[PDB]
Design a protein around this ligand. Structure first.
Ligand SMILES: Cc1cc2c(cc1C)[n+](S(=O)(=O)[O-])c1c(=O)[nH]c(=O)nc-1n2C[C@H](O)[C@H](O)[C@H](O)COP(=O)(O)O
Ligand SMILES: Cc1cc2c(cc1C)[n+](S(=O)(=O)[O-])c1c(=O)[nH]c(=O)nc-1n2C[C@H](O)[C@H](O)[C@H](O)COP(=O)(O)O
Ligand SMILES: Cc1cc2c(cc1C)[n+](S(=O)(=O)[O-])c1c(=O)[nH]c(=O)nc-1n2C[C@H](O)[C@H](O)[C@H](O)COP(=O)(O)O
Ligand SMILES: Cc1cc2c(cc1C)[n+](S(=O)(=O)[O-])c1c(=O)[nH]c(=O)nc-1n2C[C@H](O)[C@H](O)[C@H](O)COP(=O)(O)O
Lengths: 385, 385, 385, 385
């Protein structure tokens, strides 16, 4: 519409200085007001009622801290390791298809750049359905030290996927995240309303993963596990890791929040030793360092964010991604000091209050008449004159 | 009022194309804006505070899924069996009196048509208080393969009901659903405010059902059971099934959500074998395939919807009913794939997280002064110029 | 102010026909829009944050029904007995001081009239601080069959109270309800803001009640008990009854909802036989027949309402009280039929679902940024043209 | 901005008479409307999402009373003892840096004055980062009977802190509250957005406190403990007391509400005798006498408020502080009468209902379409003409 130019007004010049960005929600607001209707619908949408999408975040709020005091926290280290490599931050940029919807000029290349340019380098998971080619995304990387993982959607035509694995493996990607939570559609009504899957094989099986292991040296991570039973199965077929995720609530609605599954899983993996034999990642609904800290405290090897970095890139490009990185990086550090720990390893569950972790409620319907007619108290107002 | 013509503006032409209908809530919106004040009041109203009416829905949100991954879900079948016959969908259109309030021209005939015309055929329960005669509703049916059940309100003058049973049985209806949850009024204040039961015998007893079994070969289903104790009693007198329902919250307010009772009942029916000897249906507050999947997972033989199909028919007639059917049908399929099952039989409770099923809360009153005076955080705004 | 005449507009002629009053909340709305600022502030106010005031109502919503079906409910009886006498309804009009604030001409006399005029006769508890004299309130009673109890606030000057007991006892009041929950102020900020207790002895003791028993033949009921421990003490000194109440939330804020205390108490009184030796009443936050039914199901001998009848009288006088009486009377009847019982005695707890009775929650603070920036789904709109 | 003069209009003359101030929330309202943007941002802000800040308050609402009746409460005493001295009230004014932001002329001196001028004298904790010098704040005190404690932020340059301790000790302060919950920043985004720690040593350790005990005769209280484990450690090194606090939610977000920790701690301190050997204070989110009563009932020696007295002083100065003092003092008295106790010692947990103390919930995301399309009940309106 002509209103695209109304956005050009917002977008151009009116965007606040990247330094004036205080948190990840700021990137989201700016994005909702500048991104094209198609882009925004695709980025911000979840499946159906978007309950799980939102529930992913809400669940973090069922966990409170039990911080230690009078501990020397002058020095604090947040670097850790993931899938064999050493990472500067305990978080990473998750796979998001069609980044050119928000970043028409550079797409995933600006993400690749933003992730490995600055002082801090974040692992970037590359989407099978990215707007750019795996070649130009891996080449865009400004650091030999930065990590890039590849998200795999196995094709119905396995020959195509067979080659893909070969190509990205050759291109140097450090690992393979095969997305198992998107066999079907996962209706995005926000997008649908706007218009007014052969690439994804609906027949993937544990046997196929068993065969994927033979066709690659790259660490394999089954992205999209939604139950402890499958985390165990992953360990059984011996894959490198698993990502407790529900696709950011873009797939099955009423899928539990990954953090809630994490809390259930780890203890079982610990009462079976599998703890060290399987790297459990977790994503969806993470917007603050404190969220990352709860996941890390429960056992997650690393925590992933999708939409925040997506919105950052769609507003400020490569630099926004770096700003987002710094932001989340500083939040993890400061809150760590306040928790009384100086390293990621020291991040244990004993620092968490999980007593209300299952206070996932649904009250009874509001009494509209009683509360409508009721007049609440008031603050003492100023003199008129 | 003259505003009826304001509705003719909405209704006529302004109604969005039936294909532009994304979900069941859409039928409801359109309906609230086009149906006559009397029709809307009668269709949308519940008893008193409409707590149960709404609670019926809310309860589904206390159940989350535990979906299986890496399972071949290319093929998925949702057909099942209900009261002896084979059904294409695990859901059905429940009885709703006076369909001509919303569909003046065809009333229940368009529901009959919409249910058996398309590729998918849904069982239609026919109301004793329907606007059309049982003869013209059964004749309206476009398919020999479609199922039509009859909802019975036993009259005080049992002679009238005796004949009814004979007539609808002769007319070919597949089963008798005798409604036991409406012995009294069940005040609909929305309707009452607008105006500013001899047909239903208040003396029905288990003995009467015992005698109804003798006067008919048709499967008998006691519609309106609200406690496990009565499901058991139903099994004791040997009726064909039962419908855990509270009349869509149009009768006793503060009656539990049927899905909540379902979860309590089935395990008892299983620890008594009665499970297979009694077909437990469940209705009220079902608006999405995921709702139908939770009930099917708990043990329901079939799930029923009343208002959604009512609103569909009142806006788009026969075709709206088919659209609503397709919609709910596609939602059940897709979410099924995402759960990791390929058939209705595979839908078991192990796919459900019922840990917060009883988190039916009522918080303490809001502190209006504390939260009134409190100013919340803000997103970083755009530059003015 | 001149706006008092703006109220004269509302009040006069504009008030809807008393028949057009559907429920007790209707009386409240009309009242808030017609009563004088002083009257409304005094009638509608509770102590401090008005949490308990509101909590009294909310608690009823933590109790759901388990109604029996296929039970002959043609005939239904709601008459019961209280403090020796036989009552038509299981509820009564509780004591409310200064009824002339809302009913300048007749005050408590219209309440006395409304309670004993019509077909149904409700016990009226008479307040020590009523606007009328105990003589003219008892004389205003249009029925020999109607009951009138007296609410007693023992004076610091016990001589005055000694005489009062003699006088009202002589005047024929059936019982003495001595209010024990108002030794101090109980700040009504709504009223206080408007202005911009020697009568109540703060030294009352169980010993004084023991002496009150000797100076009267009238059944004594300690009004305002807020803990099981005191219900037991009441039974120990041998008084006639007790009223689990917190003064309608006009006294101590954060006092439990009486229904919540009732549910705790009765079982203890039953495991000690005291059940029959002590009549437990319960008031506050009761606005519907279903509320009355839950209390009666838990064990309450009778349920009291204050503000509803107060608002009724302040809007429609004697007749409003009768309308309110009919209203609550019809609600108790209809819901009873729906529960599957035909008498008050048959109202037992087995008809209640008390599994979420303690789901008195206080969620964690809302995430203002996450939910602010979030855009929710939308209903498919109509065509513009 | 020029709008500072718009505030001068509010502030000057338009402020309601100090007597017209009904509660502590009133001081807050007036303050939000008259304090400079910088002052208000700094006074009203919490860290990040301000969840803990708000949660501190909300937690009090998970505790209800079990008040005793028929107890002589004519006389009621609220004086108690804290850190060796005798106090008139069981509460105190907590340390708040930069009081001159809100009270440019007198700052902390007016707090000092307001606390010791009137009939009632409240202990004033003096901040290390106060706008005034410790000398002029201690000299401002109008009473020899008033108590003044000193809040200590140990400097990285311990020599500076060593002197401070010597000076304030010499100046006569009664105790040392060394703040251990602020080693790092604790981002106040409200303030940050407005702009668009060498004084606090991040290396403080239990050993340092052990050495602070040797350099002073003053009772030492570790302010900012957030877990039972540290309360125990405090007792182990033998300090005088502890303050269960999270800095008013200005530090770690998702730190539990201190009252919630109090309830967990005391019983452990009692099952170890430590109860009398360690004075447990508690602050944050206290706005009413009933809040102070719950903390006192759980075992707190004294309860502290920060913002309320801060807002009082920033609007009405010395007199506002006295008004706030009177207000909170009257609220504690009245509610005490209503609870059935006459002294602070009689305040025990048996007067508390802690059964829903852990009902800290986070419901599942609202179903926006279902509740959007739903039309709720309505009150019967007045006649138009
Ligand atoms: C927002 C978004 C997420 C996508 C994403 C695209 C978008 C725009 N997609 S999708 O188009 O196929 O649905 C992918 C993708 O390419 N592949 C994948 O495995 N995950 C995909 N995800 C999910 C992603 O990997 C994270 O699970 C998700 O973003 C995490 O949720 P938050 O955004 O809430 O952190
Ligand atoms: C909405 C509605 C429901 C009616 C219905 C009429 C309407 C307009 N009515 S009623 O006139 O007596 O109240 C019937 C009816 O004819 N007979 C019956 O057994 N159920 C009747 N029901 C209830 C229906 O069978 C389902 O239980 C109900 O609609 C399910 O609730 P939802 O609409 O929330 O799915
Ligand atoms: C609304 C109201 C209630 C009063 C009442 C006056 C009003 C205006 N008052 S009071 O002025 O002293 O606080 C009395 C009274 O005279 N004596 C008494 O024992 N109860 C008194 N109550 C409390 C009454 O007996 C019931 O407990 C209360 O009204 C029940 O709460 P609901 O109004 O919420 O049903
Ligand atoms: C509101 C506020 C609180 C401050 C305070 C300043 C303000 C404006 N500050 S701060 O500049 O370092 O963040 C202090 C302070 O000087 N030192 C300290 O120990 N506590 C400080 N506190 C915390 C205070 O001691 C209480 O813990 C806090 O105010 C209690 O929370 P409520 O305000 O919710 O009662």
């Amino acid at each position: 519409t002509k209103e695209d130019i109304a956005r050009k007004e917002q977008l151009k010049s009116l965007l606040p200085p990247l330094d004036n960005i205080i948190n990840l929600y700021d990137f989201e607001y700016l994005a909702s007001q500048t991104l094209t209707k198609q882009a925004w619908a695709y980025y911000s949408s979840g499946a159906n009622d978007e309950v799980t999408h939102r529930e992913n975040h809400n669940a973090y709020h069922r966990i409170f801290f039990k911080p230690k005091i009078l501990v020397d926290v002058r020095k604090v280290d947040i670097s850790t390791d993931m899938l064999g490599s050493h990472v500067d931050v305990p978080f990473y940029v998750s796979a998001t298809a069609l980044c050119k919807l928000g970043n028409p000029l550079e797409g995933e290349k600006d993400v690749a750049r933003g992730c490995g340019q600055g002082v801090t380098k974040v692992p970037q998971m590359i989407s099978t359905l990215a707007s750019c080619s795996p070649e130009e995304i891996i080449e865009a990387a400004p650091s030999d030290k930065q990590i890039q993982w590849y998200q795999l959607y196995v094709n119905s035509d396995r020959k195509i996927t067979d080659d893909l694995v070969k190509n990205v493996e050759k291109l140097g990607v450090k690992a393979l995240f095969v997305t198992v939570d998107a066999p079907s559609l996962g209706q995005k009504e926000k997008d649908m309303k706007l218009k007014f899957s052969k690439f994804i094989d609906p027949s993937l099986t544990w046997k196929d993963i068993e065969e994927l292991k033979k066709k690659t040296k790259l660490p394999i991570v089954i992205k999209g596990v939604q139950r402890t039973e499958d985390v165990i199965k992953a360990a059984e077929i011996g894959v490198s890791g698993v990502v407790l995720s529900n696709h950011g609530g873009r797939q099955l609605d009423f899928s539990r929040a990954p953090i809630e599954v994490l809390a259930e899983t780890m203890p079982i993996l610990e009462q079976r030793n599998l703890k060290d034999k399987l790297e459990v990642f977790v994503d969806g609904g993470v917007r603050r360092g404190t969220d990352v800290l709860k996941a890390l405290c429960l056992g997650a090897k690393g925590v992933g964010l999708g939409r925040p970095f997506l919105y950052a890139n769609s507003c400020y490009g490569r630099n926004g991604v770096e700003k987002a990185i710094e932001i989340l990086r500083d939040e993890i550090e400061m809150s760590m000091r306040l928790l009384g720990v100086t390293s990621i390893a020291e991040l244990k569950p004993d620092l968490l209050d999980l007593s209300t972790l299952k206070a996932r409620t649904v009250g009874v319907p509001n009494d509209v008449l009683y509360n409508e007619v009721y007049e609440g108290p008031t603050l003492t107002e100023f003199e008129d004159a």
